[PDB]
């Protein structure tokens, strides 16, 4: 059973800090992009994706705005934070009740990759389908497939439960020279 794991994991969860590795693969499983870094989560709508290798990129959701910062390009994109549970269900962990609201959740029967999976089929409008993989230490993997068949597989390790965050963990601090742009449509 996999829903057991999600609820044991997000049992009394206010914050989350850990490391990730990300592999983007094509239909035949060949890795096309691979990177790693740090991920942090805090209720009710704050996250931070810190890419470290092979380039630095910072994504921060401060609760009201989402910032995408690329240091090498000296530009940050800002937009208002709307419903970010249909762009990354990882925030739907710190509030587990959200998952069943925008996602037709469904538990796979066959264990895969050594893990018990939940299929997150989307109702709200994102991606085509997510899947959360749970193992001995909690959430171990997340997988998302987009409309042109490209899959992103994100693995996790070093989870620290409810930590003491620095007060800028979920804030974007501009550096001098950086272009600040809105999100084009």
């Amino acid at each position: 059973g996999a829903r057991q794991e999600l609820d044991t994991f997000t049992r009394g969860l206010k914050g989350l800090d850990g490391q990730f590795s990300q592999r983007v693969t094509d239909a035949n499983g060949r890795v096309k992009e691979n990177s790693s870094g740090r991920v942090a989560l805090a209720t009710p709508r704050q996250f931070r994706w810190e890419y470290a290798k092979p380039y630095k990129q910072l994504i921060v959701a401060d609760g009201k705005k989402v910032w995408v910062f690329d240091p090498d390009l000296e530009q940050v994109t800002v937009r208002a934070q709307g419903s970010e549970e249909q762009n990354s269900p990882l925030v739907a962990l710190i509030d587990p009740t959200r998952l069943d609201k925008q996602y037709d959740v469904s538990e796979e029967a066959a264990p895969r990759d050594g893990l018990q999976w939940l299929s997150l089929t989307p109702k709200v409008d994102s991606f085509q389908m997510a899947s959360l993989g749970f193992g001995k230490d909690g959430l171990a993997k997340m997988e998302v497939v987009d409309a042109v068949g490209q899959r992103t597989a994100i693995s996790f390790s070093g989870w620290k439960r409810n930590p003491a965050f620095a007060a800028d963990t979920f804030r974007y601090t501009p550096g001098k020279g950086v272009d600040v742009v809105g999100d084009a449509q």
């Binding site: 992009e33 989402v66 530009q75 084009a184 449509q185």
Partner: protein, 180 residues
């Protein structure tokens, strides 16, 4: 210009023009006025044919533009609504995302080559005889840093900024892939 630098730039261009299938991966930041965007770019070229994938950061959603520089047409797949197509691939991309990138001219500019049959290009050379700035087709293209050469791979740009009025493109090319 130095005579050795003259010959090196002529051999760089002739080698590239003689190998029209290639690709690169890098990162792009677009801007027009106060809005814009960024993402990871995979660009595959096969003569006049291009296949361009942009992988978005938080959305996680990539789009794929395919077009042809001899017609100028392109098609754009992967966005909500379904696939869009039209006679001008730059305009297809513009209407669908709000991004301006001169896609029909990039296959030459990103290699620091000027377009053929396009109208005389103003070219400024750096101290080694490599293009530093190219003016062509309404756009000003700056070559800020170069990828190291090897026996198999001629000098190719690594950081480009292109501007047309208030439309701005910044490109970092992280990895080239070429014919042997």
């Amino acid at each position: 210009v130095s005579e050795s630098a003259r010959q090196a730039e002529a051999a760089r261009q002739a080698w590239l023009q003689a190998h029209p299938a290639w690709s690169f991966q890098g990162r792009v930041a677009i801007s027009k006025g106060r809005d814009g965007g960024s993402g990871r770019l995979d660009w595959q070229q096969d003569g006049p044919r291009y296949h361009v994938q942009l992988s978005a950061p938080v959305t996680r959603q990539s789009w794929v533009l395919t077009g042809d520089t001899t017609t100028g047409a392109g098609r754009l797949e992967g966005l909500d609504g379904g696939p869009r197509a039209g006679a001008d691939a730059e305009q297809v991309l513009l209407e669908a995302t709000g991004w301006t990138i001169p896609v029909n001219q990039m296959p030459d500019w990103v290699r620091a080559l000027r377009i053929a049959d396009a109208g005389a290009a103003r070219v400024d050379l750096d101290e080694h005889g490599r293009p530093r700035t190219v003016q062509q087709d309404g756009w000003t293209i700056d070559f800020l840093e170069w990828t190291p050469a090897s026996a198999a791979q001629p000098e190719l740009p690594r950081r480009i900024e292109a501007r047309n009025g208030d439309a701005k493109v910044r490109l970092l090319v992280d990895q080239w892939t070429l014919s042997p």
